[PDB]
């Protein structure tokens, strides 16, 4: 559950960085995708990454 949705459940980090066991829904799968590609990034890389992705982020948030 750290790598991929195993039997319909998957691990996503909390606000604080604590692992939580959530159903691998589109919403939670978005969450896990953002943990890998956004929330891990350092604060000197975060904001220039968001503005670069702005389109893709808004389409997923609105959709999923």
């Amino acid at each position: 559950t750290y790598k991929k949705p195993t039997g319909g459940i998957v691990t996503v980090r909390s606000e604080m960085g604590e692992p939580i066991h959530k159903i691998a829904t589109r919403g939670v799968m978005l969450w896990k995708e953002f943990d890998e590609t956004i929330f891990n990034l350092p604060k000197n890389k975060l904001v220039p990454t968001l503005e670069a992705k702005r389109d893709y982020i808004i389409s997923r948030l609105n959709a999923d």
Side-chain angles (χ1 to χ4, degrees):
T1 63
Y2 300 118
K3 297 282 164 295
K4 59 179 67 64
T6 321
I9 295 91
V10 75
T11 313
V12 302
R13 292 151 53 230
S14 87
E15 313 154 53
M16 293 139 264
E18 312 307 329
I20 316 166
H21 260 153
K22 308 202 195 177
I23 295 182
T25 51
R26 292 194 285 112
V28 162
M29 268 322 300
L30 180 54
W31 188 314
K32 201 185 178 51
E33 156 192 9
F34 282 163
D35 277 349
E36 161 173 51
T37 69
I38 295 181
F39 303 128
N40 64 330
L41 283 171
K43 281 68 177 183
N44 62 272
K45 188 71 211 318
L46 180 51
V47 181
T49 304
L50 293 175
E51 66 93 7
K53 296 173 67 168
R54 163 171 205 89
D55 296 310
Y56 175 60
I57 288 167
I58 288 173
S59 66
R60 300 286 273 130
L61 287 181
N62 269 332
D64 283 28

